[PDB]
Ligand binder design. Structure first.
Ligand SMILES: OC[C@H]1O[C@H](OC[C@H]2O[C@H](OC[C@H]3O[C@H](OC[C@H]4O[C@H](OC[C@H]5O[C@H](OC[C@H]6O[C@H](OC[C@H]7O[C@H](O)[C@H](O)[C@@H](O)[C@@H]7O)[C@H](O)[C@@H](O)[C@@H]6O)[C@H](O)[C@@H](O)[C@@H]5O)[C@H](O)[C@@H](O)[C@@H]4O)[C@H](O)[C@@H](O)[C@@H]3O)[C@H](O)[C@@H](O)[C@@H]2O)[C@H](O)[C@@H](O)[C@@H]1O
Ligand SMILES: OC[C@H]1O[C@H](OC[C@H]2O[C@H](OC[C@H]3O[C@H](O)[C@H](O)[C@@H](O)[C@@H]3O)[C@H](O)[C@@H](O)[C@@H]2O)[C@H](O)[C@@H](O)[C@@H]1O
Ligand SMILES: OC[C@H]1O[C@H](O)[C@H](O)[C@@H](O)[C@@H]1O
Ligand SMILES: [Ca+2]
Ligand SMILES: [Ca+2]
Ligand code: NA
Length: 700
C-alpha cells in the first residue's frame, strides 16, 4: 500500500539563457503512513521528441513532502520551449515548462505588482514573485502605481530617498518594498517594468519643474488644460504634449531616474486613450495620436543610451481594435519591445479580437502582443446571500424600492447598534471577495464597520447614489478564510455615518469557463494576456489593486496548466514564423460536431496555422457559449471521439499526428493513430480527437 501525489513541479527561473542550468523541482508528498522508497523519473520533451531522461532513488517519510530536484543544461539553441515531466510512479506525476529565451520580449508572459506596503516583508515580496514565476511562468511584471507623483516619481528630501510616500489614492508605498520585489523579479530572470504615464503630471506641477507651456488644451487660447479630475477639488492629473521636446526631456529623465535608482528593466508607458480637438499652448491643433510614436522612439534611444541592458519599453494602445485610435501608428512605427493593448468594447467578439491581433502582428513584423482584457468586468458573479434572509440586528426586511434581488432587502439601517449578519459557507481555503449590493441616497458616502467571525476587519465606504432605487455593488473587501462556515457582519458603529439598504452579499468569483476560452483564443491567435499578479490575484478592473473578485482553486489549477502549455509549445504559438495557413474553414471537418472556422457561437472553432517545420490545427470549443470573450460563460459541451479530417497539400510531408491540450494529461503530447486519404474535396489526414473541452492543438 504505497500512495501520494506530486503537488507542484516548477523550475528555478521563469526564463533561461541558452546553456544555463535548469533546476526542475517536483514537490512530492507521501500520503501513506510509512516512508516510501522508489525511483523518480525525469523526461524532458521538445514538442514531440523526448530529448533527455534522468532518474534518482529517493526516500520520502510518511506524511512528508520532499523536493525532488534534477539539474539540466539547457540546449544551446535560443528560443526553445520544452516540457519537463517528473514521474514518481505510485506517488503520481507532474509537468512544467522550461523557457529558453535570451530575450523575454519574444515570449512575454506579463504579470503585475500593485502592492508596496511598508509591512510587506522580503519573504512576502519574494514569495509572491516566486509563485507567479513557478506556477504561471511569469517572466515580466508591470509595477502599477509604485510612483509618488506621475511627474516626480521618486520622492526625495534633498538627495535622500524618503522611506515611504503617499500615492494619489492615499496608499502608503515603501521604497524598500519596491526594491525587494524588483530584486525578487531579477532572481527569476524576470524583467521589472515601471508603470508611467506618457504625458501626466499631478496638481501644482509648476513648482516641480514642469512648465504649463508644455501642456495640451481643449481650446486654442490655453484656457482649459486637459486633465483627469479625481473628484475632491485637489487631486488631478494634467496632460501634456508628447511631441514637446521639453516635456520629453523632463519625463524621459524621470524614466531614467527610475531605471538607475530602482533597478527597473524598462518602462510601461500608459495613456488615457482617445482625445479629440487637442491644441498645444499656442493654439496649434495637434494630430494627437501621431505624437506618440516620436515620444516612444525618443524615449527608447534615451533608454538604450543610458543602459542598453535596461532599455525596455511598451506603450498601451487603449481601446484596441482593427484601425483603432493610435493602433496602426504605434504598432507600425513605435520602437516598443512588445506590443500592449487594453481591450474595451470595439473588439467584443473572438473573431474581432483575432483580427486586431493579426493586424498588430502585420504592422509590427510580428512583435509579441500582450492584451489587457479585464475578464468578467462589472458582473456581480459568485455565491449570493440575500440580506433579507440574513440575521438582523435593529434592522428590518422591506421591498418598497425596486432593483433588489430575491424577495427584498434590509432597511432601517441608520442607527449605531444596527447590524446585518450573513452566515456564509465556503468550499475551500483562500481569498473570498466580499461584494455588497446596496442603496444609498444619503447625499454622501456612508460607512459601516465589517466584522468577520466577530473580529473587526475594516471600515467600508458606500458611495452615494442618485436615488434609493439606483443600486451599487462597488463596495468590496477581500478576506482570507478557512473552509466551512463564517460570519460576515456589516455593522453601524459609533463614528460610522449615512444610511443604506443592503440587497445582498456576493462572494466575487472569476469564472473559469470564460477565462480558459479567452486565454485559449488569445494564444491561438499569437497573443498573451496580462491578468495575474501579486499572490495569484487576477485583474478585475483597470485599477489593478481592485480585489472585487477572487480565483477559486480549479481556476488557479487550470491557469497553471494553460500558462505552462503556452510556454512548452511557445514555438508553435508565438515565434514570428508562425502564420495563418491561407484559405478558410473548408480545410477541416469534424464529423457530427458542428464547427466553424470563424469563431461562430456554439461551434467547435478550428483555426489552421503553419511554421516551416509544422502544420498546426487549434480546436477551441464554443459549444454551449457565444462569440464574446469577456463575459462569464457556461461549461462547454464536452465532446468525445470526434472523427476529424484535415485537408493538406500533396506537397506536405507527414510522419506523425501529435496532440496536446491544457485540459488533459498535464500538457503532454500524445501520438495519434491516423490515415491519409483522398476524396472529392482533396487529400486529407484522418484521426480521432479523444476529447475536446476548452482547447486542443494538433500538430504534424
Ligand atoms: O484598493 C486601494 C484602496 O484600498 C482601500 O480602500 C478599498 C476600497 O477602494 C474603493 O473605495 C475607495 C475609493 O472610492 C472612490 O473610487 C471608486 C473607484 O475606486 C477604484 O478605482 C479608482 C480609479 O481607477 C482608475 O484611475 C486610476 C488610474 O488613473 C490613471 O490611469 C489611467 C487608467 O486608464 C487607462 O485606460 C489604463 O489602461 C489603465 O491601466 C489606467 O489605470 C493613472 O495613470 C493611474 O496611476 C491611476 O491609478 C480608473 O480610471 C478610475 O475610473 C477609477 O475611479 C476601484 O477599482 C473602482 O471600481 C471604483 O469605482 C474614490 O473616488 C476614491 O478616491 C477611493 O479610493 C472601492 O470602491 C471599495 O470597494 C474598497 O473598499 C483604501 O482605503 C484606499 O485608500 C485605497 O485606494
Ligand atoms: O492563517 C492566517 C494567514 O493566512 C494568509 O496567508 C496567505 C498568503 O500570505 C502571504 O502574503 C501576504 C500578502 O502578500 C502581499 O502583500 C499580497 O499582495 C497579499 O494578497 C497577501 O495577503 C504569502 O506570502 C502568500 O503567498 C499567501 O498567499 C493571510 O493572508 C495571512 O495574512 C495570515 O497571517
Ligand atoms: O439630507 C440628507 C440626509 O441623508 C441621510 C443622512 O444620514 C442625514 O444626516 C442627511 O441629513
Ligand atoms: Ca435582496
Ligand atoms: Ca462568451
Ligand atoms: Na461538422
Amino acid at each position: 500500500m504505497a500512495s501520494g501525489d506530486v503537488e507542484r513541479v516548477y523550475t528555478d527561473k521563469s526564463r533561461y539563457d541558452p546553456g544555463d542550468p535548469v533546476t526542475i523541482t517536483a514537490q512530492v508528498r507521501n500520503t501513506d503512513s510509512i516512508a516510501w522508497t522508489g525511483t523518480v523519473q525525469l523526461r524532458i520533451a521538445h514538442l514531440e521528441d523526448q530529448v533527455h531522461t534522468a532518474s534518482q532513488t529517493v526516500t520520502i517519510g510518511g506524511g512528508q513532502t520532499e523536493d525532488v530536484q534534477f539539474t539540466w543544461t539547457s540546449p544551446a539553441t535560443d528560443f526553445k520551449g520544452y516540457l519537463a515531466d517528473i514521474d514518481a510512479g505510485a506517488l503520481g506525476s507532474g509537468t512544467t515548462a522550461i523557457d529558453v529565451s535570451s530575450d523575454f520580449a519574444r515570449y512575454p508572459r506579463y504579470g503585475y505588482v500593485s502592492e508596496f506596503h511598508p509591512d510587506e516583508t522580503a519573504a512576502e515580496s519574494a514569495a509572491k514573485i516566486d509563485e507567479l514565476a513557478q506556477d504561471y511562468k511569469i517572466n515580466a511584471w508591470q509595477f502599477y502605481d509604485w510612483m509618488w507623483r506621475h511627474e516626480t516619481m521618486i520622492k526625495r528630501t534633498g538627495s535622500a530617498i524618503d522611506s515611504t510616500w503617499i500615492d494619489l489614492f492615499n496608499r502608503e508605498i515603501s521604497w524598500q518594498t519596491i526594491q525587494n520585489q524588483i530584486d525578487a523579479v531579477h532572481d527569476q530572470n524576470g524583467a521589472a517594468m515601471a508603470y508611467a504615464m506618457i504625458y501626466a503630471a499631478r496638481e501644482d506641477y509648476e513648482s516641480y519643474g514642469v512648465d504649463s507651456e508644455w501642456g495640451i488644451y481643449q481650446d486654442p487660447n490655453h484656457l482649459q488644460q486637459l486633465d483627469v479630475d479625481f473628484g475632491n477639488n485637489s487631486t488631478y492629473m494634467y496632460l501634456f504634449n508628447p511631441a514637446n521636446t521639453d516635456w520629453q526631456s523632463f519625463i524621459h529623465a524621470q524614466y531614467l531616474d527610475a531605471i538607475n535608482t530602482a533597478g527597473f528593466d524598462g518602462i510601461h508607458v500608459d495613456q488615457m486613450g482617445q482625445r479629440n480637438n487637442v491644441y498645444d499652448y499656442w493654439g496649434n491643433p495637434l494630430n494627437f495620436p501621431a505624437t506618440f510614436t516620436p515620444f516612444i522612439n525618443e524615449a527608447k534611444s534615451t533608454l538604450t543610451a543610458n543602459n542598453s541592458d535596461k532599455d525596455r519599453i511598451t506603450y498601451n494602445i487603449v481601446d484596441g481594435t482593427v484601425d483603432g485610435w493610435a493602433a496602426n501608428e504605434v504598432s507600425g512605427g513605435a520602437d516598443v519591445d512588445f506590443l500592449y493593448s487594453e481591450i474595451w468594447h470595439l473588439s467584443d467578439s473572438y473573431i474581432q479580437l483575432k483580427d486586431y491581433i493579426d493586424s498588430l502582428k502585420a504592422n509590427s513584423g510580428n512583435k509579441a502582443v500582450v492584451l489587457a482584457a479585464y475578464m468578467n468586468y462589472r458582473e456581480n458573479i459568485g455565491d449570493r446571500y440575500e440580506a433579507e434572509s440574513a440575521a438582523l440586528t435593529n434592522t428590518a426586511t422591506n421591498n418598497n424600492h425596486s432593483g433588489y434581488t430575491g424577495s427584498g432587502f434590509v432597511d432601517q439601517f441608520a442607527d449605531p447598534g444596527d447590524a446585518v449578519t450573513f452566515s456564509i459557507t465556503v468550499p475551500e481555503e483562500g481569498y473570498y471577495s466580499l461584494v455588497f449590493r446596496f442603496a444609498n441616497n444619503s447625499g454622501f458616502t456612508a460607512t459601516r464597520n465589517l466584522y468577520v467571525d466577530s473580529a473587526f476587519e475594516i471600515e467600508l465606504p458606500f458611495q452615494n447614489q442618485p436615488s434609493w432605487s439606483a443600486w451599487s455593488h462597488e463596495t468590496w473587501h477581500q478576506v482570507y478564510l478557512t473552509p466551512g462556515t463564517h460570519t460576515i457582519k456589516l455593522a453601524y458603529d459609533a463614528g460610522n455615518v449615512g444610511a443604506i439598504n443592503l440587497d445582498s452579499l456576493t462572494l466575487g468569483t472569476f469564472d473559469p469557463h470564460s477565462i480558459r476560452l479567452a486565454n485559449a483564443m488569445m494564444a491561438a491567435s499569437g497573443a498573451t494576456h496580462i491578468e495575474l499578479g501579486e499572490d495569484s490575484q487576477m485583474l478585475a478592473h483597470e485599477y489593478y489593486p481592485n480585489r472585487s473578485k477572487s480565483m477559486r482553486s480549479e481556476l488557479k489549477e487550470a491557469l497553471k496548466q494553460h500558462y505552462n502549455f503556452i510556454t512548452a509549445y511557445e514555438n508553435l504559438l508565438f515565434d514570428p514564423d508562425v502564420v495563418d495557413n491561407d484559405s478558410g474553414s473548408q480545410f477541416v471537418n469534424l464529423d457530427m460536431v458542428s464547427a466553424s472556422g470563424d469563431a461562430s457561437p456554439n461551434t467547435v472553432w478550428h483555426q489552421v496555422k503553419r511554421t516551416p517545420e509544422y502544420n498546426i490545427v487549434h480546436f477551441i470549443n464554443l459549444a454551449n457559449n457565444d462569440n464574446q470573450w469577456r463575459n462569464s460563460a457556461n461549461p462547454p459541451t464536452l465532446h468525445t471521439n470526434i472523427a476529424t479530417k484535415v485537408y493538406v497539400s500533396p506537397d506536405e510531408t507527414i510522419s506523425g499526428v501529435y496532440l496536446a491540450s491544457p485540459d488533459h494529461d498535464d500538457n503532454r503530447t500524445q501520438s495519434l493513430a491516423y490515415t491519409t486519404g483522398t476524396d472529392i474535396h482533396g487529400d486529407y489526414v484522418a484521426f480521432t480527437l479523444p476529447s475536446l473541452e476548452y482547447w486542443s492543438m494538433v500538430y504534424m
